[PDB]
Structures are given as structure tokens and as C-alpha cells.
From a paper:
The [name] E3 ubiquitin ligase is a central signaling hub that integrates inputs from plant light‐sensing photoreceptors. [name] contains an N‐terminal zinc finger, a central coiled‐coil, and a C‐terminal [name] domain, which is essential for proper [name] function (Deng et al, 1992; McNellis et al, 1994). [name] regulates gene expression and plays a central role as a repressor of photomorphogenesis by directly modulating the stability of transcription factors that control the expression of light‐regulated genes.
Indeed, CRY1 and CRY2 also contain potential VP peptide motifs within their CCT domains, but their function in blue‐light signaling has not been established. Next, we obtained crystal structures for the different peptides bound to [name] (1.3–2.0 Å resolution, see Tables EV1 and EV2, and EV4) to compare their peptide binding modes. We found that all peptides bind in a similar configuration with the VP forming the center of the binding site (r.m.s.d. between the different peptides range from ~ 0.3 to 1.5 Å, comparing 5 or 6 corresponding Cα atoms). Chemically diverse amino acids (Tyr/Arg/Gln) map to the −3 and −2 position and often deeply insert into the [name] binding cleft, acting as anchor residues. This suggests that the [name] [name] domain has high structural plasticity, being able to accommodate sequence‐divergent VP‐containing peptides. These observations may be rationalized by an enlarged VP‐binding pocket in the COP1Lys422Ala mutant, increasing accessibility for the COL3Phe288 anchor residue, and potentially abolishing interactions with CRY1Asp545. Independent of this, it is interesting to note that the hy4‐9 mutant, which replaces the proline in the CRY1 VP peptide motif with leucine, does not show inhibition of hypocotyl elongation under blue light (Ahmad et al, 1995). Similarly, the VP motif in the CCT domain of cryptochromes may become exposed and available for interaction upon blue‐light activation of the photoreceptor (Müller & Bouly, 2015; Wang et al, 2018).
Residue numbers in the entry:
A (entry chain B): 545 to 551
B (entry chain A): 352 to 363, 372 to 407, 411 to 630, 644 to 675
The structure:
């Protein structure tokens, strides 16, 4: 999934 | 002074980046559709909407940064890790920097040494490049994914680095063995860093806050709350007085830097994905995960 901030 | 955002133009997938050129004359968009589109701002505002240039890319785009001296040059970062400098008049890639080993999330051209640009990546590296050199000039090995990098507006010796480790690492590039300071406060990854001025730094995070910091005396200043941001890159843009950011409620939020809760908000399954002030004016570009672009203006 795109434009997801790494966690 | 302001209570609302007026829609003055609308151009109807995810837009990762929306940015004005050096003169606030053209703006460009980029995102998951693998295309950098350049629009004329005045035409968009005056007319009832075709780009003047489109450049197709190999990979999904995460960020754009126009050159502050060369009108026609713009950098992009992509999901393959490539950092590209393009000329929007010739459509050609001028430089393709391929050292990052994973997705690059951010690129920024320095305002004061305009041949210099910095990028950050899921590969946990910050790389500084010069447009006259094929190899990186500086490499910083960090411990966690880098989500955002930004040059200080007054000097090319300082960069802010927002990390998945929840901290902002503020570096003096003259000695990268340690940062000048590391700002803790955010409770999740730091997704954006943007300067309001030489000494004022703002950040956004998936802890649903923006924060303001003093990079002269290394102090926390203020935390801003109201929007919803737990997952996505939703955009942050600042000027001398205001912060604006997206929300996973498909709303744009504006804060004045002295006030912790919003001055106003605008309702655009969808998230705001990119925002950009027109310098210190009340006008703003905005875009969301459906690909819609709106020009908004703060108004009484």
C-alpha cells in the first residue's frame, strides 16, 4: 500500500 | 483574520507531492501514476486544465523539489530509490542518482547552494548530491528508515532528518559523525520536516501531531492537534506564520504557529496527500489520494 509512513 | 479556506480552482491516483517553482509561476505534481505534471498557476486559476509538460517515470514518485536557481530544473525521488534531476523544458533527466538501495521518500534542493540536493530512504541512509557530480558527496548511515529530509533555508550546512525512530536528527554536514541535536517528542515516525525560518523547524508525525522546534537553542516549542494522521503521508507545508497539513479524514487543516488548535479546516475512504503554500501568501495548493488538486486561499 502506497504513501504509508514506515512504522 | 482568517476563518475559512476558499476554493478558487479545482483540477479533477495518489498525489505524493505538489510544489511551486522558484517564482511561484508553475507548479508540479507527482505520485503513484508515474508521471510528473507541470501546470501554469495563473492558467489554472483563470480557466475552467491541461499540464504544459508531462514526464513519464519508471517508478512511483514520493517527492519533488524544484531548483531555487535554475528555473526549469526539478528533482524527484521514487519508490526504486532513484533520485532524478529533470529539465522541464527539454523533458530530459539530467542526473539519475542510483545509490539508494530502497525507496527514497524525500528529496530537497538547497536554497542557498542550489546545486546541492539531499535525499532520504528506507535504506536508512541520507545522501547529499551535487548536480555537477555523479557520486554522492556525503552519506550518513542511520539506524532506521528516513521519511523526510530538508535543508535549512539559510545555510546548506544544516539538514533536518525525520526518522521512523520517532526523532528529528538535525545535522551539520561539516561533521556528520554525530548530529548537532536529536529532537524527541513525537510518539511515532516523523513523516515531514519543514522550516518556517532559519531557526524554526516544524514536523509532522503519524502520532496525529505537528510540532514546532527551535533549532538555534534546541528546544521544543509547541504541539498542534486536531487532524487525523495515523498511517499515511498526508502532507505538511509551512511559511513564516502558518502550518498546513492533510488528514485521513480528507480534510486540510491550517494552524497559526502560535495557536495549538486549528484556525480552519476544509473538507475536500480518502486522505489528503500533498500540500504547498504559495510562499508567505494565504494561497495554497492541495491534492488528495483520488488525484484531485485544489487551489485554496485562507479568507476572512
Amino acid at each position: 500500500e502506497d504513501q504509508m509512513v514506515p512504522s | 483574520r482568517y476563518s475559512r479556506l476558499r476554493v478558487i480552482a479545482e483540477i479533477r491516483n495518489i498525489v505524493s507531492s505538489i510544489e511551486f517553482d522558484r517564482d511561484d509561476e508553475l507548479f508540479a505534481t507527482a505520485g503513484v501514476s508515474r508521471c510528473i505534471k507541470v501546470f501554469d498557476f495563473s492558467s489554472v486559476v483563470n480557466e475552467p486544465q491541461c499540464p504544459i509538460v508531462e514526464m513519464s517515470t519508471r517508478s512511483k514518485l514520493s517527492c519533488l523539489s524544484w531548483n531555487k536557481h535554475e528555473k526549469n530544473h526539478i528533482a524527484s525521488s521514487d519508490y526504486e530509490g532513484i533520485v532524478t534531476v529533470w529539465d522541464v523544458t527539454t523533458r530530459q533527466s539530467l542526473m539519475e542518482y542510483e545509490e539508494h538501495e530502497k525507496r527514497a521518500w524525500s528529496v530537497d534542493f538547497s536554497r542557498t547552494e542550489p546545486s546541492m540536493l539531499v535525499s532520504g530512504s528506507d535504506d536508512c541512509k541520507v545522501k547529499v548530491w551535487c548536480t555537477r557530480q555523479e557520486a554522492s558527496v556525503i552519506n550518513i548511515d542511520m539506524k532506521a528508515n528516513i521519511c523526510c529530509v530538508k535543508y535549512n533555508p539559510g545555510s546548506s550546512n544544516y539538514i533536518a532528518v525525520g526518522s521512523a525512530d520517532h526523532h528529528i536528527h538535525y545535522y551539520d554536514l561539516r561533521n556528520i559523525s554525530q548530529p548537532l541535536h536529536v529532537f524527541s517528542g513525537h510518539k511515532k515516525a516523523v513523516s515531514y520536516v519543514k522550516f518556517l525560518s532559519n531557526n524554526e523547524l516544524a514536523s509532522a508525525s503519524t502520532d496525529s501531531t505537528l510540532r514546532l522546534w527551535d533549532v538555534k537553542d534546541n528546544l521544543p516549542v509547541r504541539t498542534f492537534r486536531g487532524h487525523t494522521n495515523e498511517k499515511n503521508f498526508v502532507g505538511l507545508t509551512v511559511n513564516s506564520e502558518y502550518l498546513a497539513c492533510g488528514s485521513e479524514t480528507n480534510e486540510v487543516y491550517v494552524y497559526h504557529k502560535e495557536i495549538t488548535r486549528p484556525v480552519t479546516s476544509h473538507r475536500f475512504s480518502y486522505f489528503i496527500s500533498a500540500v504547498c503554500w504559495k510562499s508567505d501568501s494565504p494561497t495554497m495548493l492541495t491534492a488528495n489520494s483520488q488525484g484531485t488538486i485544489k487551489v485554496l486561499v485562507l479568507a476572512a
